[PDB]
């Protein structure tokens, strides 16, 4: 919040203006999925795939 002040020799604020509580909000949102996909065959797993990690 932000405000403003008033000046008066004695402090009489009868005819002055007073600050209001204006509320503001900042929005956050989600993005897009990051997806990495691979595929391969069981025969290849059996006869060719080593050091898979």
């Amino acid at each position: 919040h932000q405000f403003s002040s008033l000046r008066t020799p004695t402090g009489d604020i009868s005819g002055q203006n007073k600050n209001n509580l204006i509320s503001g909000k900042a929005t956050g949102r989600v993005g897009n999925y990051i997806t990495v996909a691979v595929e391969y065959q069981q025969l290849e797993e059996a006869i060719k795939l080593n050091q898979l990690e």
């Binding site: 069981q42 797993e45 059996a46 006869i47």
Partner: protein
């Protein structure tokens, strides 16, 4: 019948053009043959298969 490496011969004379050949049996009969073989003629093995995800 290699002529530069005689040590690997397995037949008395080299087959060449004009020789006479035959095919065993008759024309188109169906038969169940009988087998005879050494231990070290044909091998056999099996490949294990990994579990599907």
């Amino acid at each position: 019948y290699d002529t530069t490496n005689p040590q690997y011969n397995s037949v008395s004379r080299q087959v060449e053009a004009g020789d006479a050949v035959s095919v065993v049996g008759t024309a188109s009969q169906t038969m169940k043959p009988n087998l005879f073989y050494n231990k070290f003629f044909c091998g056999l093995g099996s490949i294990p298969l990994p579990k599907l995800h």
